[PDB]
Amino acid sequence: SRQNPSDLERAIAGALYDLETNTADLKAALRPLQFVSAREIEVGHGKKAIVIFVPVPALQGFHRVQQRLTRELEKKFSDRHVLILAARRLTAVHDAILTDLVYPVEIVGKRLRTKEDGSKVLKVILDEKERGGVDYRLDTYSEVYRRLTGRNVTFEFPQ
């Protein structure tokens, strides 16, 4: 593809190979995929979160099959938050990063709050149908967006 491996690039590659073999009985987007990309930077304090970059047909491939896959990869891989993201190289690309980063939920709104001075902030508010399994991951979504892009956006469910 485009890289020479790293210590956890080989780890995530051998992970998806031991998802090739000795498991399910579910096999859709795993075999036509090779090493694509992976990245690891601190989130919060004391905790980490892995992100894995994937090509654009494999995006909707993983959108067909991503339920319980992130779950098992989180459980047997380092007990940490797994995020799946495209590899790209401006604002439409940033909205693409947003809607790729939030996989089970469709966002509802982007909210640009100006203040009493020229300071501004963004708030993206998500769907109401799924709330329970995200609030422990919302901060991780926010910090990985802040590290990959650099813009300060906060993620919330409206009330």
Contact positions toward other proteins, by CB under 8 A? 44, 109-119, 121, 123, 135-136, 138-139, 154, 156, 159
Q: Evaluate whether 98 touches 107 at the Cβ level (below 8 Å).
A: yes
User: From CA 92, how far away is CA 101, in angstroms rounded?
Assistant: 14
| 71/110 with CB nearer other proteins | 110
| 103/157 with CB nearer other proteins | 157
> Long-range contacts: 90-98, Cβ < 8 Å, 24+?
94/149, 94/151, 97/145, 97/148, 97/149, 98/124, 98/145, 98/153
| 62/141 with CB nearer other proteins | 141
Tokens encoding 48: 């980490």
Q: In angstroms, what is the minimal distance from the CB of 6 to other proteins?
A: 28
Q: In angstroms, what is the minimal distance from the CB of 56 to other proteins?
A: 25
Q: In angstroms, what is the minimal distance from the CB of 157 to other proteins?
A: 11
Q: In angstroms, what is the minimal distance from the CB of 124 to other proteins?
A: 10
The label of the residue with tokens 């959108």 reads 63
User: From CA 93, how far away is CA 69, in angstroms rounded?
Assistant: 26
| 16/122 with CB nearer other proteins | 122
